[PDB]
């Protein structure tokens, strides 16, 4: 048969490893200091005991068992209880403030034999080490030893560089069958943790780097390229909160769709968003406004001057206003918050104000990856998503988005300024709709105390899209 | 000329100009997980199963049991061939609880099995550069006298560092293959190179490959001979008016490009293109990289076409995938793979601009030439869509500059007429045919696209903001 | 400082005569560079071209194999050994060492009356300060013996130290470096004379190709070679285009057909190539975007029978992806094919295709080379160049190679009355008058037809003109 694997039950990993770690073989987990090796090792054992009734041995080489049990209480895992229930054996191989190899393989086997233990975690084998071929042969002996037992091993290894050699010595890499590289890449002044499976001998795996976050629920990996173009798509309509906009969308937005609001600063994106949120609470549905530009304080003042009261919506428990600076974390961290926050609130409508805030400084690819995730998560979860985008230029803009994410959205609302008679008008347009007919008219519109009023088209003008048209 | 032995690895025999030179050792160096072992296993396996050429595998770390088990993954029974006496896994790995000695064992094994092939994996784990060359030289030199073609595995620490670990292994061997696993920004890319073959020609540079269920599959971008068939056979676009604008419809043996701003009607044309195939009981595949099976099924139904029906009839397969789910190399395989099972008459990729996201224009072009080329030589009508970055005033058909690779170009654009977003369609070019040269207005309905009349009384129609005459 | 001719294509140019006589020349380089091929070709040429006997010292490769490897290039070293013009000296170990070697070299030189010596590789012998003296000794002895030697050395890094130990350079009188540099995924073979003590040579690196004929270097600087130029005319194949140029294209000239995709560059090529064969003259067609079947089909739709012209051995079609080879290799394929057919006209369709993925310096070098070869061999070259922009193009070429062409035929779309019409312009003609009018031209089953100019329009060059 094909190489049998053993599920780790670490969010994402088992999809990246196409099942889990090859059973009976050792797997190297190497990374710089604070990459998540120990955690990868604990979480690996814990889940086997709790879920599969597979006992585990943790082989510490410096961390006192008090501290291992103590660090586990942070993630809400109680190791002490599994010790006292004879399921998890912590095997202190740290020296009190040669016997190595043969002596230790006996000790770890006396424990492997004693607990019927199907899983082992050695952390960190590096600290035992010796020149170049010394680490290779002493290591190899240990791997080949455990393979004879028929036990499945996680081998924490250290690193000095972030994209340097795999291990410390340039040997371990090859001794082991399965190699996992953790990274904590400094991208500007922020840190992006990624896990890569370099090889699993005798089996396929997902290639490349995958981002993850160490939350209070452990390692959470988002398989960026393991989401499936496999979501539901109804014809159920919903209201935008603007009646003339619903008319122009051929009877309102689709429930299962991503809507994009594109225009210069001060064109009315946050007004359409505010409105899009107030419609959900008006029909007794929960909504989340993900603000990254304005504070709750300012989002209420401005909403109340447009006629709508966020307070009664919040108190009724139908509207959550979140608010975060994009620079406060990295994209994976934000994507984590958003997914986390949608689960505990279970809304029918998400709104992010704005994507253009989150694209700042971050690379185009890194940004798009975030957008394929948030767009993709909403789509498969049957949640309507309105995403605001502020164009870098206020006039003469030729591209909808500067990040080029138009092919990812289903519906594009387009706000733009228009200069007539030495004044600055606005002009909404339903630029596209996937499914609906939609109005093809660039209707002028005004904002008041009442909200948005969508009047008539500029029938007697040429080059409306320019920003300074000419009366025909 | 030097005599070569066919390896039966997809792409290698063409890259090596006939296989590995016979009676010489070939060095295959790479970083961890590069496909070194796989290359050597295959070398032997494909040798045994095809030409009844027996082979020997020397292993210094991996147990023989494991070389047999790992091989089962690719659906090959190495165990059956050990019994049959065609293979022999000479276990040279250390015991948990020699230079000339091994050579004698390897020599003995060769005659003891009439073996024409060898694979020593890896001759580094056995190990001072002064010393490593002398013994490595002895081994490779010995094997030349035995008269046995050899694949010798060696390890590396850096993708563009020294070819092998000790800056010696290279110069000893007659033949050097580098397997690479380059990090293309969070996505990996597997390339095979032949750095030197003493006494013969080969192909130069990096050639990308994939490790799959069927082993190593290399796509030689530079040997796919631009020597492909052609006809004047016409196939319908799925729109009678567009067919007329092309001068009888599309050519069968042609790459078509549908270009335009976001939501101009590309994915609609892709739909009508695919349906028309199912109408004439001909198979087609729809490669969707932006929508989803449901949203495609839906959006099409609101255009009066049942994809649900076509799939049930097995005349339409829909392969949905995110562009960033894998690197280009993998995609090209999936695309080429899905075309070999289903054996279609027409292919559709929606869209190319989606795949060019976050990738060097080179990797893209090579990929595009790849798919273009394959469909062309396989006599398959290819409709590819491209979203222009600029919705109005676009000065270039594509930002990837792949217009020259296409044969036919359907250009869709927005036209601002009396405060409205009207659309237009013009057959920009058509190699072989006449085609209409008119920027004719069209509307989309429940029925689909209706191609009306040109903007006769307008100036600067392309700019997207025209002017009344 | 007297020099020995290598007869290695173009090396004698770079070296200003060849290798300094009675001195060793280091030829360092990474694996697969062509050091062993260089040193073999240095002796072989020495024998066949001057009857200068050579001695080849091998420290790894068995004499048996060195012969087998050479049979590749069509050279028979076995015959040259039996005849005693070449002596392969085996100094490999079994499967007082430097001095023992000198003696055996000095033995063969005196025994075989040998002018040339090749030692590959001196490095492999050794196993830093110590390497210097042993090498110095080896060279100093060979200068006493009075032998011009080639000495191969190996390198780890492609732009790192000129030799393994960072010494071999300083001890040698002459230094040559072979490089096999990686341009993305394609390889580029470059040769560089780093120094020749006592003499002049061409500085910097020069590309080369290892072919069935050995090391073929292109000294991309020492070209010009005078080239001849006449006022002889040649029909373009389009009657009006012939007039608009002032009697046709000059015989010894570079024609450029720039324009947006689908404007008709390939049609202008097709007729240009036909016109040669209508006057029983050979022409090669170098295609980089269209297969011979498609070129055959589309031509047949414009009237011309490509198949008929191919049978009479007048018209030759090439066809090759740019991504298949590098630029140096493409230059060779063309330089080769011209020699094997000796055509009156080459047609490259397109230069724009071959510029893909390459640096403009690397590309522009390629163009200089193709131009200068066609110009000096008096082959009239038409070249096509599809522009990046189909309307609003402000530059004739995006490669900036307009100064390298003598004549430019500029096609462009013109937006008239809601339709896409094309226009032909003779943009320049060094030597002739040429028409200065932007003319409209249709393409029918019969080929092109150039009608009347757009005199009643403004802003034609933009592609969106205004009626006035
Ligand atoms: N409850 C928690 N909430 C959030 N982050 C946490 C929590 N507990 C631990 N972390 C973080 O997760 C990281 C996990 O690193 P881990 O303890 O696995 O070290 P390691 O990767 O083995 O490296 P080292 O060799 O330095 O021990 C810690 O550095 C810590 O910053
Ligand atoms: N009470 C009001 N009466 C009338 N118009 C108002 C009122 N309050 C705000 N506006 C209008 O609404 C605009 C506010 O911009 P809005 O938040 O709607 O859009 P936005 O594009 O998201 O803004 P930004 O790009 O600055 O984040 C102001 O420029 C103003 O013209
Ligand atoms: N059945 C399979 N399907 C897909 N990929 C596979 C399969 N089996 C193995 N692989 C891939 O092959 C790689 C391992 O190949 P191989 O063992 O030849 O590597 P290697 O370069 O010899 O490594 P090392 O020398 O460090 O052992 C892994 O990265 C894995 O993803
Ligand atoms: N039922 C319908 N009735 C009328 N018009 C429709 C209908 N369905 C779609 N349309 C129009 O046609 C467009 C369809 O375009 P299509 O789905 O081909 O997108 P596209 O041009 O591929 O662009 P993108 O890649 O950005 O989605 C819609 O945006 C809308 O303007
Ligand atoms: N007939 C041929 N046609 C084309 N290329 C050839 C031919 N014969 C050999 N080559 C190429 O030319 C090179 C000749 O190798 P050569 O032994 O000269 O290199 P080298 O740098 O001395 O190698 P090393 O130092 O590793 O021994 C090889 O890369 C080979 O691929
Ligand atoms: N039989 C025909 N009748 C009329 N026009 C034709 C015919 N065949 C081709 N054409 C026209 O010729 C054009 C193609 O010209 P050609 O192939 O020379 O283009 P090009 O300038 O080389 O551009 P590219 O190489 O980018 O395709 C088509 O756009 C088409 O309008
Ligand atoms: Mg730790
Ligand atoms: Mg705002
Ligand atoms: Mg291996
Ligand atoms: Mg689409
Ligand atoms: Mg050599
Ligand atoms: Mg062309």
DSSP bridge partners of C241: none
| C60, C68, C353: residue with CB nearest B404 | C353
CA distance B274 to B258: 14
Q: How far is C436 from chain B (nearest CA, A)?
A: 25
* Phi, psi for residue A441 in degrees, rounded to 5: -95, 135
CA distance B69 to C353: 48
CATH 3.40.50.300 fits B4-218, yes or no: yes
> Cβ neighbours of residue B114 under 8 Å, at least 6 residues apart?
B54
Q: Is A136 touching B (CB cutoff 8 A)?
A: yes
DSSP bridge partners of B91: B59
CA distance C282 to C345: 7
How far, CA to CA in Å, does A109 sit from each of A101, A156, B377?
A: 12, 19, 61
Q: How far is B394 from chain A (nearest CA, A)?
A: 8
B near C: at least 3 beta-carbon pairs less than 8 Å apart: yes
CA distance C33 to C157: 12
**Residues of B with CB below 8 A from A108's CB?**
none
Q: What is the CATH number of domain A243-472?
A: 3.40.50.300
DSSP bridge partners of C259: C386
3-state DSSP assignment of residue A441: strand
CB-ligand 6 contact for B429 (6 Å cutoff): yes
Active site annotation includes C60: yes
Closest to B88 measured CA to CA, from B70, B115, B126: B115
CA distance C58 to C64: 11
Residue A38 Cα to ligand 1 midpoint, Å, equals: 7
* Phi, psi for residue C350 in degrees, rounded to 5: -135, 160
CATH topology match: B4-218 vs B234-469: yes
Cα radius of gyration rounded to whole Å, chain A: 28
3-state DSSP assignment of residue B243: helix
Residues near ligand 1 with C-beta < 6 Å?
Answer: A 31, 33-39, 74-75, 124, 156, 214, 216
Ligand whose nearest atom lies closest to the CA of B405: 6
DSSP B431: T
Q: How far is B404 from chain C (nearest CA, A)?
A: 6
Cα radius of gyration rounded to whole Å, chain C: 28
Dihedral over Cα of C365, C371, C372, C374: its sign? positive
Residue A34 Cα to ligand 1 midpoint, Å, equals: 5
How far, CA to CA in Å, does C414 sit from each of B2, B169, B173, B457?
A: 59, 63, 62, 16
User: Would you say how long chain A is, in residues?
Assistant: 472
DSSP bridge partners of B207: B192
> Cβ neighbours of residue B128 under 8 Å, at least 6 residues apart?
none
DSSP bridge partners of A89: A57
Q: Is A202 touching B (CB cutoff 8 A)?
A: yes
> Cβ neighbours of residue C195 under 8 Å, at least 6 residues apart?
C174, C175, C201
C near A: at least 3 beta-carbon pairs less than 8 Å apart: no
Closest to A382 measured CA to CA, from A247, A246, A250, A236: A236
Active site annotation includes C154: no
Closest to C345 measured CA to CA, from C235, C231, C218: C235
CA distance B119 to C271: 57
3-state DSSP assignment of residue A5: strand
Closest to B109 measured CA to CA, from B150, B70, B77: B150
Task: Give CA A89 to chain center in angstroms.
Answer: 34
Closest to C10 measured CA to CA, from C404, C322, C332: C332
Q: What is the CATH number of domain B234-469?
A: 3.40.50.300
Cα radius of gyration rounded to whole Å, chain B: 28
Residue B218 Cα to ligand 7 midpoint, Å, equals: 41
3-state DSSP assignment of residue C257: strand
CA distance B15 to A458: 63
CB A256 within 8 A of CB A231: yes
**Residues of A with CB below 8 A from B295's CB?**
231, 233, 256, 410, 434
How far, CA to CA in Å, does B436 sit from each of B142, B411, C26, C56?
A: 72, 12, 66, 70
Q: At what angle do helices A364-380 and A331-345 cross, to 10 degrees?
A: 10
Closest to C321 measured CA to CA, from B432, B409, B205: B205
Which chains have 3 or more CB–CB distances shorter than 8 Å to chain C? Answer: B
CA distance A84 to B53: 60
Give the number of other Cβ atoms within 10 Å of residue B468's Cβ.
11
Which helix (DSSP H) or strand (DSSP E) does residue A37 occupy? helix A37-52
Q: How many angstroms separate the first and last alpha carbons of chain B?
A: 73
**Residues of B with CB below 8 A from A145's CB?**
96
- CATH topology for C233-468? Rossmann fold (3.40.50)
Residue A406 Cα to ligand 2 midpoint, Å, equals: 24
Q: Tell me the structure's resolution in angstroms, rounded to a single decimal.
A: 3.1
CB-ligand 5 contact for C212 (6 Å cutoff): yes
* Phi, psi for residue C422 in degrees, rounded to 5: -100, 165
User: Would you say how long chain C is, in residues?
Assistant: 468
> Cβ neighbours of residue B196 under 8 Å, at least 6 residues apart?
B175, B176, C31, C32
Contact B145 C419 (CB under 8 A): no
CA distance B454 to B441: 6
Way the structure was solved:
X-ray
CA distance B406 to B403: 5
Q: How many angstroms separate the first and last alpha carbons of chain A?
A: 76
CB-ligand 6 contact for C404 (6 Å cutoff): no
CB-ligand 5 contact for C154 (6 Å cutoff): yes
To test the ligand 6 pocket, which listed residue (C264, C286, C297, C319) has its Cβ within 8 A of the most ligand atoms?
Answer: C264
Ligand whose nearest atom lies closest to the CA of B404: 6
User: Would you say how long chain B is, in residues?
Assistant: 469
Q: By 3-state DSSP, what share of chain B in percent is helix, strand and coil, each rounded to 5?
A: 30, 30, 40
CA distance B345 to B339: 10
Chain B residue with minimum CA distance to A369? B324
CB A239 within 8 A of CB A246: yes
Chain B residue with minimum CA distance to C463? B460
CA distance C347 to C382: 5
Which chains have 3 or more CB–CB distances shorter than 8 Å to chain B? Answer: A, C
CATH superfamily label, A5-221: P-loop containing nucleotide triphosphate hydrolases (3.40.50.300)
Task: Give CA A472 to chain center in angstroms.
Answer: 51
| B181, B185, B322: residue with CB nearest A229 | B322
Q: How many alpha carbons fall within 13 Å on the CB side of residue C421?
A: 23
The residue from B50, B61, B104, B416 that is catalytic is: B61
Q: How far is A79 from chain B (nearest CA, A)?
A: 33
Per domain, the residue ranges of chain A are: 5-221, 243-472
DSSP bridge partners of A193: A184
**Burial group, residue C136, by CB count within 10 angstroms (0-12, 13-18, 19+):** middle
CA distance A265 to B158: 48
Give the number of other Cβ atoms within 10 Å of residue A274's Cβ.
24
DSSP bridge partners of B192: B179, B207
* Phi, psi for residue C28 in degrees, rounded to 5: -80, 165
Best of B22, B163, B204 to disrupt the C interface by mutation (most C CBs within 10 Å)?
Answer: B204
DSSP bridge partners of B430: B408
The residue from C61, C192, C289, C290 that is catalytic is: C289
The residue from A138, A196, A247, A293 that is catalytic is: A293
CA distance C83 to C112: 11
CATH superfamily label, C3-217: P-loop containing nucleotide triphosphate hydrolases (3.40.50.300)
Q: Is C392 touching B (CB cutoff 8 A)?
A: yes
DSSP bridge partners of C193: C176
């Amino acid at each position: 048969q094909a190489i049998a694997k053993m599920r780790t039950m670490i969010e994402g990993f088992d999809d990246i490893s196409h099942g889990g770690l090859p059973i009976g073989r050792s797997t190297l987990v190497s990374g710089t200091s604070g990459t998540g090796k120990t955690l990868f090792s604990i979480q690996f054992l814990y889940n086997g005991i709790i879920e599969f009734d597979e006992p585990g041995v943790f082989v510490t080489f410096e961390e006192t068992p008090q501290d291992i049990i103590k660090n586990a209480r942070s993630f809400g895992w109680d190791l002490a209880k599994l010790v006292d229930e004879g399921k998890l054996f912590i095997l202190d191989a740290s020296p009190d403030p040669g016997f190595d190899l043969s002596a230790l393989i006996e000790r770890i086997n006396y424990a492997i034999q004693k607990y019927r233990a199907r899983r082992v975690s050695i952390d960190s084998v590096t600290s035992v080490f010796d020149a170049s071929s010394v680490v290779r042969r002493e290591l190899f002996r240990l791997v080949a030893r455990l393979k004879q037992i028929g036990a499945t091993t996680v081998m924490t290894t250290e690193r000095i560089e972030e994209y340097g050699p795999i291990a410390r010595y340039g040997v371990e890499e090859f001794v082991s069958d399965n190699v996992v590289i953790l990274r904590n890449v400094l991208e500007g002044e922020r840190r992006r943790r990624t896990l890569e499976i370099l090889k699993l001998r005798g089996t396929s795996h997902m290639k490349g780097e995958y981002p993850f976050t160490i939350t209070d629920h452990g390692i959470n990996i988002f398989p960026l390229g393991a989401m499936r173009l496999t979501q539901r798509s109804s014809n159920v309509r919903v209201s935008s909160g603007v009646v003339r906009l619903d008319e122009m969308c051929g009877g309102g937005f689709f429930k299962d769709s991503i809507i994009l609001a594109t225009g210069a600063t001060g064109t009315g994106k946050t007004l359409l968003v505010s409105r899009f949120v107030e419609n959900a609470c008006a029909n007794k549905e929960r909504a989340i406004l993900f603000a990254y530009e304005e504070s709750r304080a300012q989002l209420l003042r401005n909403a109340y001057s447009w006629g709508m009261d966020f307070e009664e919506m919040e108190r009724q428990n139908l509207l959550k206003i979140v608010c975060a600076y994009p620079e406060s974390a990295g994209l994976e961290d934000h994507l984590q918050i958003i997914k986390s926050e949608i689960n505990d609130f279970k809304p029918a409508r998400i709104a992010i104000d704005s994507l253009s805030a989150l694209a700042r400084g971050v690379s185009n690819n890194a940004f798009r990856q975030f957008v394929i995730g948030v767009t993709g998560y909403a789509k498969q979860e049957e949640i309507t998503g309105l995403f605001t985008n502020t164009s870098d230029q206020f006039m003469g803009a030729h591209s909808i988005t500067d990040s080029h994410i138009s092919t990812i959205t289903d519906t594009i609302i387009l706000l733009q300024y228009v200069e007539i008679r030495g004044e600055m008008s606005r002009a909404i347009n339903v630029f596209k709709m996937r499914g609906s007919w939609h109005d093809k008219a660039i209707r002028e519109f005004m904002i008041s105390d009442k909200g948005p009023d969508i009047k008539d088209s500029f029938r007697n003008f040429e080059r409306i899209i320019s920003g300074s048209p000419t009366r025909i």
